Symmetry: D3
Subunit: 72 residues, 6 copies
């Protein structure tokens, strides 16, 4: 279910650290080249949405969480 | 207008090369950590959307294009 | 891209918000015919829930730790 | 871009699904702090409900007419 | 999630905006190769038209009833 | 994130698609009241056009060069 909560373990946190640190560094380097304005701001908001899905893919990877809390 | 076409010059192409190669390296490193599945696929599609805005920000940066083609 | 590690209060707020939407989603989905529009509804709803869950998890009082990168 | 002209059952289904989502949204919103994430939750939910409402409106038996262009 | 039950004037405006966009979309689609970008163009356009149609339906004079 | 450098045929296809949508969009916008829905229509339409323009620029026979990264 889209509503499930994955209780991530350290392996999940480690994977998330790798992906977020990697994207953070790349995003800072790209943002430094872009002029302030609407397109730069939309790039940032679209990138934040993308990262919810990358983070969820890591958090729910077999071995990266200990238990799932389900609702209903 | 959202419909304007910026004819990029070499400085725009150089900026776009920097931003796209930076994101391609980061995306490949992140994708290598993610399990095959829907979330990985949505990450990629959201990231493609984000990059249209980063690329447009670079292409229309003052000094990065020579002329704008306008319609209507 | 901060990560918020929720405390018990954050977990309980997330229980409330996710339980509330899951119940409403079940009732609505059971009324909708199968097909493209029902699928897209679920896609958009999941996107909404990422933002609601982040709002709850990053609310002051709801996290033990913020991890920055 | 079909235009659905719903009949009485279509209006009833849409009333149920929108009433159900409005109640759940209100309960969730009361738990969320003001800010960007809460605002995006609302906008995503509005997108979701366009598709749920289209699904209901074009359900067999729920329309007087579907106008095509 | 307000509902607008349009009157004839709202239905006429909606016919004009949707007919206009459908004609333009068909002309553009006839130029585009099959594939992912063409498919996403269509779904993005459907999303856009939900908002255009709601703007027209809630225009003063275009609705007979608002249901809350 | 390949970059397509259009040739003349790609530029002329882009002229056709962008001038067609700009005229339609102007006609529609002139019917719409100012407000949030009109604003989101424009934002969603811009997103649509990135994909249509990319589809045209990478169509076989419409590009001089593809830059890969
Ligand atoms: N062992 C844990 N101990 C403590 N806290 C944990 C653990 N494991 C996970 N968490 C966090 O709780 C929430 C989980 O709820 P969820 O339904 O599974 O995640 P989500 O839907 O993708 O929401 C997206 C947002 O939630 C925020 O906190 C998430 C998790 O980071 C994120 O920062 C996202 O920004
Ligand atoms: N005088 C009317 N008589 C009968 N039916 C009417 C009238 N006037 C409007 N309608 C229809 O009611 C439904 C709910 O309206 P709503 O709640 O305002 O719509 P929405 O949130 O914008 O989603 C919109 C999606 O629903 C479909 O049917 C819509 C309206 O076309 C749309 O085709 C979209 O696919």
């Amino acid at each position: 279910s889209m509503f499930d909560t994955h209780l991530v373990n350290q392996q999940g946190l480690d994977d998330i650290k790798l992906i977020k640190s990697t994207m953070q560094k790349a995003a800072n380097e790209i943002l430094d080249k872009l002029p302030e304005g609407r397109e730069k701001s939309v790039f940032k908001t679209k990138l934040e949405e993308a990262m919810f899905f990358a983070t969820k893919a890591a958090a729910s990877k077999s071995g990266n969480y200990d238990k799932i809390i389900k609702y209903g």
